[PDB]
Amino acid sequence: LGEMVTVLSIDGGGIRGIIPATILEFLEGQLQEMDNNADARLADYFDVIGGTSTGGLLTAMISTPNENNRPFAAAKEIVPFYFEHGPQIFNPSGQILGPKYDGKYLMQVLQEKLGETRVHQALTEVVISSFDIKTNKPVIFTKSNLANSPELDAKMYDISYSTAAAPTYFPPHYFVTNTSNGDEYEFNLVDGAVATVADPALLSISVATRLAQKDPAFASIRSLNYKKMLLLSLGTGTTSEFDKTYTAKEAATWTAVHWMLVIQKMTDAASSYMTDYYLSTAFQALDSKNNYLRVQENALTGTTTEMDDASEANMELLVQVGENLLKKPVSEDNPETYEEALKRFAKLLSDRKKLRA
């Protein structure tokens, strides 16, 4: 168990980020109780912490060092963050030409809570996604892969704004770093969901697998041995309820405007289903299905669907969805609930740390 690699992955979902945050508040509290340490943080138990958009914001806030070289935010401080800053991040600009939001508040609160910290300072391996619209390539921010190409040692707020810079919602982000030669290196980044990874769990598994080639602490998964891998992937919920879906017939006359307000939700939903299929296939092939815990909501209803509904009523509903998810079964045939599976996971995390110490 001591040689096992631990990976945490958080999906994007806008305001639906309350759901994995509620899930992480429960898990961090389990670890704090078991280890008799109220200062116990997720970055102390996870080797890799991956996140896209709001999952990336979360990743950055629990990986960035504070004044004590401790993770900046506790898991229980994330739903209050979403409740406090969510209505101001998701406050419409009112402008006719451009995105729904100016991104001014989102950047300001990120700057405020992340400071001048760089990715090389992360307390664990981070995997925060984006897509560069100038190089037309995904740009994945890691603590590793910095030895080669130091121009990726970007500010945590530039990484965090970029991962969440959703086309039509917020404007793309432009920022500069410096290469080894001292010359400028340009970034023109949009949301990580564009880079096809709304669900960054497979990307996070690949980063760990690639690190296993150059790091002895990751050596146990060196030849795809996911038997020696613990993966916690967290979703922001999907929906199949006919009230919130569409027919091919009604969509026959849909213009470019209607599609744009709906494709991100579709690709993000598809990203969840495909990445889960890839990972289940791989873990079930090695007879290690329980090494991969995917905490996801499949029946979002009402306002709970929308990514930018930062009203008090929708935020309270998202908490309720998160708290009901804990009592919901892991599978259709498995009676084991998520709260129970998360206790088993916390125990494994707790036991691996002790042995490594």
Residue numbers in the entry: 25 to 381
Authors' own words:
Currently, little is known about the inhibitory potential of OP compounds such as DFP and MAFP toward patatin, beyond the fact that DFP inhibits the insecticidal ability of patatin. Consistent with this observation, we found DFP is capable of inhibiting pat17 with a 20-min IC50 of 182.1±11.1 µM. The 2.6 Å structure of pat17 co-crystallized with DFP showed an aged adduct consisting of a serine-bound DFP moiety lacking an isopropyl chain, indicating that aging had taken place. The DFP-aged structure contains a negatively charged dealkylated oxygen. This negatively charged oxygen was within hydrogen-bonding distance to the oxyanion hole (being located 2.6 Å, 2.7 Å and 3.4 Å from amide nitrogen atoms of Gly37, Gly38 and Thr78, respectively) and 5.1 Å from the Oδ2 of Asp215, which together with Ser77 comprises the catalytic dyad of patatin. Furthermore, the phosphoryl oxygen of DFP was located within hydrogen-bonding distance (2.8 Å) from the Oδ2 of Asp215. Crystals of the DFP-pat17 complex were grown in a solution with a final pH of 5.4 (measured at 4°C). Consequently, based on our structure, we propose that hydrogen bonding between this negatively charged oxygen and the protonated amide nitrogens of Gly37 and Gly38 help stabilize the negatively charged OP moiety within the active site chamber of pat17. This is expected to be similar to how the oxyanion hole helps stabilize the negatively charged tetrahedral intermediate of a native substrate during catalysis. Taken together, these observations suggest that the protonated amides in the oxyanion hole of pat17 may play a role in the aging reaction by stabilizing the emerging net negative charge on the alkoxy oxygen during the dealkylation phase of the aging process.
